[PDB]
Amino acid sequence: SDIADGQTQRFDFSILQSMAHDLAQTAWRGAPRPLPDTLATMTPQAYNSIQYDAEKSLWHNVENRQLDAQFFHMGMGFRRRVRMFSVDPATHLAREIHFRPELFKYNDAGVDTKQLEGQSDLGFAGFRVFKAPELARRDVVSFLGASYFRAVDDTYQYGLSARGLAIDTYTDSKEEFPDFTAFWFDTVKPGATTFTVYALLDSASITGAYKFTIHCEKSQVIMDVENHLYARKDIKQLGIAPMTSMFSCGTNERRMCDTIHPQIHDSDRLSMWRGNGEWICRPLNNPQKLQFNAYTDNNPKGFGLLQLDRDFSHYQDIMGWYNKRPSLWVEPRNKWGKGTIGLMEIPTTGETLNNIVCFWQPEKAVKAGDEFAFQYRLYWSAQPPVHCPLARVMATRTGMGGFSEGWAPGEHYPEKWARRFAVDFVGGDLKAAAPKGIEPVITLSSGEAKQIEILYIEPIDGYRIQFDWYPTSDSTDPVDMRMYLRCQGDAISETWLYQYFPPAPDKRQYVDDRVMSLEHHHHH
Amino acid sequence: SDIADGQTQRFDFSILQSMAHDLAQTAWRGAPRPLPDTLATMTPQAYNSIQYDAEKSLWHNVENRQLDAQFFHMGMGFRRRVRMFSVDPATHLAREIHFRPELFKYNDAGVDTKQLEGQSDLGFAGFRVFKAPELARRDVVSFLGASYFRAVDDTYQYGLSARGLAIDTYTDSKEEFPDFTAFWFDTVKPGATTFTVYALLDSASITGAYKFTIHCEKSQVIMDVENHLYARKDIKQLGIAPMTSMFSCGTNERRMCDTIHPQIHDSDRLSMWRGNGEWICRPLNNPQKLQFNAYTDNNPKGFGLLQLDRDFSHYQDIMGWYNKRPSLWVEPRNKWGKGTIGLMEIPTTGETLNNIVCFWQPEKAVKAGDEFAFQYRLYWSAQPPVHCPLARVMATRTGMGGFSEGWAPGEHYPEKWARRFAVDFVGGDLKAAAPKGIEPVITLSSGEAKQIEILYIEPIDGYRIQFDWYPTSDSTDPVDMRMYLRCQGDAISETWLYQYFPPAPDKRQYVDDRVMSLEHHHHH
Ligand SMILES: OC[C@H]1O[C@H](O[C@H]2O[C@H](CO)[C@@H](O)[C@H](O)[C@H]2O)[C@H](O)[C@@H](O)[C@@H]1O
């Protein structure tokens, strides 16, 4: 009856650490063996019409179950055979769920199932967990990819994603993508919306043992992650608790915004809570040139890629519902010590490319034989679980300056070239601080802040800081900008880090291409 | 006590039509005489520090006054001396209000009030009306300019303008700006929010007698307008009931949208209700080339420039509050017969130039001696007083096309060049009609409509019609597009008229200037 009917074996979190440790001592298993021909040469239509059998779900036998799970068929870009096991947490005894065609319904699929018959080694691509009131529709957790996984809050819309690990995302060499190659699921308890799933990570450079304790709460999904990592080789770049999102069109430097969509992004900013208590808002970019930024920290308290613009009218996407897509908050649960938060921002021209990658990278160079243990909570939800207790950046608007706000000239372009920055703040003591006097403190790597203005914005009960950036140089070098609000010498806001790309000096001017002629009269 | 203290003279609407018609028999009075030297050479500071004395207001002596009025001082571009009169409607007697310096507080004006002592013929630039509970501050109606005037709804935010008359706005010659040279004010009744103001129009080409019965309602201003017009010369273009708005950056053809404001406009569309009963929604353009359009009609039922996007977040303007600015509806009160609704859209690069002019222009060529009479109601309010009983366009969005919606390529631009149009409809019977089948009927001057899609939009309970436009020709000639929704042989929506400007053939392609280099790593 239960789908998991393989050889019984003892399993616990330490046996997996041993598996992973022992595995690190041998040669990497290498790239996956080709799939059976019937799957190797599949049209998307064909794959898509393969459907896991809902009545053979992982936990079909558990009464009052509030959670169930199904498996994705191997095929398409899923070339790694992920093995799946069921663990009775009472007896610490695991049984393998072997792939078999009986587990699936191949409908209008022209799949030669006969060549799948003895392929009990095929395993699956990954898995999804459903929660009540619907246990076979609208998954809330999905592990499917390499180390990749994602989840949803009460909107049920999937957005940014996370991975078990990142290796060499940005270096002299090509990036390496560790696979999760096996998952052990503790049988859910009747009534529970918490489930436990251990995973084995395997890769040319490194193995790991992972435990995921996953809480499908009413408003969000919380994941208690513990990992143990075993380097096989020297590693150039190790990325702990990595996130992957997309940013094409935002309120900032809008250079890829010729769609019907006012904004296009899965996430709009990096939030960092630093070990010293400082909060940072790093508005994400769609740079024309690939960028890596490393934010030095020690014992980071938290960091996330957030989607805080929840307004459909700002996106107009009735396919992907970007306004419903969630935020991801990484809460270190042990002291991670010295290192950097890496943000890679890749140039994109649409929404098909996850062009945003963020992770933690320990200070210390990774050498063959090094071992690591990280614990962290992930919160999949619209609003992060924590935010600055002070004035918070709500939005970072950028555009032409060189004029007076409200009086942008209609007949000529502006006299001088400048770039306008508008940073709206909403938050704590802004109201009580306002009479006492709010000074923005601005810091620029290059250029001069001019026409600094502080303006009340009734509709969001906040304050807008505008300044015009005037260049001092012919340099196209990135401009690292920094801003916070001050009041009687004390800071009253989070810090805003921005990365501006000044245009070429030949393009620091406007081309006025208008024509005012009696050539275009039309009668209807 | 009252400020009206010139010579008693009989006055009524007939007597003004006589002044106007008699005035037409003589030569135009010509361009205004130079102002006194102190006002000719004024800093905008100096002028702005002149304040009409609220204790000398027009209706200071009326008890239970729900309305009052004040005058604008002559100066700056106010060069025509407008004469102002008070009428007792009981006795049909009218006393002039002569300019006297004592009616104003000059403050830090730096003005030789002594060369303003004798000047009884100076008059004023214009007038404004205030309504309780603020009869000295938030104005609701303002006549100031030439034939120009404007009003506000319960937002109390000024936006687009009207005029008495438009002359030669688009022809071989330069435009002619008739001036309101005198106003007569029926004294307000106690308790009344209706007031009546008569106006004399005077211009090189034409004179006129205007009556404005102006209702300052709770939620809007309604103006009952009657004029009589007396042509002194042949006239190339006569524009009745004209409107003047602005449109810089909307959701359509976003060619001037590099501001911190997602949208900048005082109006977004030309709404027409034709003699035959057909409704038209013509979204306004900010074209790079000056356009005139003439929409043929017979006994037009109504027309207006509407500001239907009420959403602060779509504009982010806290100076001019575009979201609060009103719609203006012209409702002809008699059968105006054959002619054209004229729409001139001038190129702009900001908000300072009113680049939208719309008016009625009768079929018949205007010759000297001609007399005209129009009656129309003006509705200054957010929502026009009447709209299509069918489905209504809510927004016209344009952008890149040639890809599948929601899968815009990230690593390349689209293979082929096309322009995407997305018209959202939010009207009636769309829900009942969807099962029966909603056919979009598209008409194109040039090019072909491919990838035509009908998509339900939950958040506005509406339907989005998208099409890619592919060129058939190397021509840059404007493309008239026309769309309505049909179901079972019947039209179920208003007609959408759009005017598209294809780009030069050499620019019907995308330039891919991305770079993927290790050149830009940054440590903080
Ligand atoms: O399930 C989502 C995708 O996951 C995989 O893709 C990620 O992992 C790959 C490593 O095998 C990377 O090369 C890739 O760039 C990542 O997106 C999977 O292979 C894809 O086909 C899935 O869409």
Numbering used by the authors:
A (entry chain A), B (entry chain B): 35 to 558
Give sentences copied directly from the paper behind this entry.
The conformation of the region that forms the reaction pathway differs noticeably between OpgG and OpgD, which explains the observed low activity of OpgG.
The difference arises mainly from the closure motion of α-helix 3 to the substrate in the cleft.
